[PDB]
Every structure is written in structure tokens, then in C-alpha cells.
Design a binder for this molecule. Structure first.
Ligand code: WWU
Lengths: 173, 173
């Protein structure tokens, strides 16, 4: 019923608690061998549940650089963030794919998931996941949640500016 | 609340609907190049939610043969089933890992998941998943659910005999 609660806990148990303790070392290995990539996994949480099929970012100010090397195969992508033509940040960035699952459940008649419940379940997914990570041992400062809703009147949104805002806070603290 | 419903739908959407349409071809490729492996993915559903940490099968009558080759990396294992010292079947076999997630949720104080609710949620996971697969296009006769509960008084159970019963039905039909 609160489908988002189970999906947050599963995403933590079967993915984040397994990948996050080895992330710092794969990043630190990249920053020796292959401007430096920042230290955390940045997780994109579009509250509209819109995740591209190829997990590929439309925004040309978010430009693919490289895959992180391995420490179970994990494909995690490093992106450069551009601002008025300038390289302004570099980080490991990806979508919270369970939001895509909520979207897909909403389309299937047998799932009992109303289309108009997507925003509420996305917000519950985000809140549950933030509460888990607040008491999570494997999170030693190695992921950041980026939750966002684009404006209601089709007014322009910059995903790159959204990401950069979060990065610059981490430089400040 | 019915956490098992969301986990069944996610397991279908984010794994089974992606792996199952390519399974027949990876199996048919193995049966040319590397006794023949049977055609379906056999999914183990222990209603006690006990899934080994190394996904490795204790029963010495279920003996690892090989990994299936690739067509996103999928590690799927081929096992030989032994009966009174004789090779009696060969299939692609694995645990429904969301049952392990139910078990783990039951251990975490913050999850709101009572230990004594594991059997009920496992049964709901199995029922939901069987209903999904009944109307599923990517299931063209390419997976089989094997649900089981060991006896209540610590009386002996054979997982190999359980698997072989299901295989021999498929030879009959
Ligand atoms: C996700 C669908 C699902 N929903 C439920 C309840 O269960 C499953 C499930 O069991 N899926 C699954 N089984 C797999 C088996 C196998 C194999 N045979 O080798 C392979 C699988 O993919 C490769 C399987 N996959 C899908 C994802 C599993 C792990 N994983 C995740 N996980 C989630 O997004 C997730 O979301 C929720 C709500 N729960 C979870 C935890 C399963 N994200 C990942 C990102 C990456 C990456 N960027 O490269 C790599 C991952 O897996 C590496 C393979 C390690 O096994 C990832």
C-alpha cells in the first residue's frame, strides 16, 4: 500500500549498503590513475518519477566523462557539470531507479497503483531513504540525495544547476 | 504494509522482464558450445526466507557445473541434480533474493517489520509473483517457481528431490 517504503528498504539492503563502503576507494584509485572527482555518490530523485530508458542525461551541461573502475559488476558513471561554458564540478551521478519502478507500476493494470499516486509515493521513497541513511553505518559521508520537482507551468529547470548547488555546499562544509 | 507486493512487482520489472526474453538463447548457445541444460530459469522460494550469504547451496546433491555465458552483467549458475549417486538433471537455478530482503527487514528495528510476519510476507511474495507471471509476455515458458516449507519438527528435507520433482513434470508435459 505504502509501496515506496518497501522499495526504499530493498534499495538500501540489496544495493546501497553493498556499493557504498567500497566507493571511496574506487574514487581514490581513479583520482591517482585514470581535475579530481568528488567523494560521494550523488543520487538523482526526480519526484515526477521520470528516469530515461538509457539512464542518459538530456542536459548538455551534464557531460559523461568515464566509468568508475571496479573494486557483482557495478557500472557507475562520472560526469562533468558545466556552467556558462566552464567545467565547474566532477562527480559520480545516477538516478534512483526505484522511482522508475513506481512509474512502471502505475502503467500496469494488475499492480493496483493509481497514476495520480506517483508524486506521493516518490516523496515517501525520498523520506524513507533519508531516514534509513541517517542511521546507516555504511554511509560515512559517501552519498547525497538530490530530490527535485520541476516548476508546475513548464518553466525552465536546470538539472546541472541543481547538482552544482549540492556540490558547492559540500565544498563549503 | 503488504511490503511483499511491491517487492514482487520490482523483482519482475527491474530483473525478470529484462533477463527472461534472452534466456532461451544463452541456454541454446551453451547447449552447442560449452547432457543438455534444461530450458527455464528455476527460482527457489524458501518460505522460511533463508537464503545463504554466498547464494551457495548446502545440499551436495545440487552440484555447481558452470556459469551461463552473457547475451548489464548477469551471473546465472548451472547445477547438476544428483539422485542416489546418479546425474538426474541439469538446470539454471537461483534464489528469489527478495525473500532475503524480507528476512533482513525483519532484523532492522527501523523497518517496522515484525519477525513473526516473515512466513505471511513470503507467501504473499510467491502469490503476487505467480499472478504477475500468469499475464506476463516475457514468460513464454522460461521460468518456474519452486516454493517450499521444510517440515515443522526438524524432519529431513531434500532440496534436490524438490527441484527434480519440478523438472520431471516438465519432461512429462
Ligand atoms: C532492482 C530490481 C529488484 N527489485 C527487487 C525487490 O529485487 C530486485 C532484484 O533482485 N534485482 C536483481 N537481481 C539481479 C540478479 C543478477 C544476476 N543474476 O547476476 C543481476 C542483476 O542486475 C545486474 C539483478 N537485479 C537488478 C539489480 C540488482 C542490484 N542493483 C540495484 N538494485 C536496485 O535498484 C534495487 O531497487 C530495489 C527497490 N531493490 C533493489 C535491490 C535489488 N541497483 C543496481 C545498480 C547497478 C549498477 N549501477 O551497475 C548494479 C546492480 O546490481 C549489480 C549486480 C549485483 O547482484 C544494482
Amino acid at each position: 500500500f505504502n509501496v515506496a517504503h518497501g522499495l526504499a528498504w530493498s534499495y538500501y539492503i540489496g544495493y546501497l549498503r553493498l556499493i557504498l563502503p567500497e566507493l571511496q576507494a574506487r574514487i581514490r584509485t581513479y583520482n591517482q590513475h585514470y581535475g579530481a572527482v568528488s567523494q560521494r555518490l550523488y543520487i538523482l530523485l526526480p519526484l515526477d518519477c521520470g528516469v530515461p530508458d538509457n539512464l542518459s542525461m538530456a542536459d548538455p551541461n551534464i557531460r559523461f566523462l568515464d566509468k568508475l573502475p571496479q573494486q557483482r559488476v557495478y557500472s557507475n558513471s562520472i560526469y562533468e557539470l558545466l556552467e556558462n561554458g566552464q567545467r565547474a564540478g566532477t562527480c559520480v551521478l545516477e538516478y534512483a531507479t526505484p522511482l522508475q519502478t513506481l512509474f512502471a507500476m502505475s502503467q500496469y493494470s494488475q499492480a493496483g497503483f493509481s497514476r495520480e499516486d506517483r508524486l506521493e509515493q516518490a516523496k515517501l521513497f525520498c523520506r524513507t531513504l533519508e531516514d534509513i541513511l541517517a542511521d546507516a553505518p555504511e554511509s560515512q559521508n559517501n552519498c547525497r540525495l538530490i530530490a527535485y520537482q520541476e516548476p508546475a507551468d513548464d518553466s525552465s529547470f536546470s538539472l546541472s544547476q541543481e547538482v552544482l548547488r549540492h556540490l558547492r555546499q559540500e565544498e563549503k562544509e
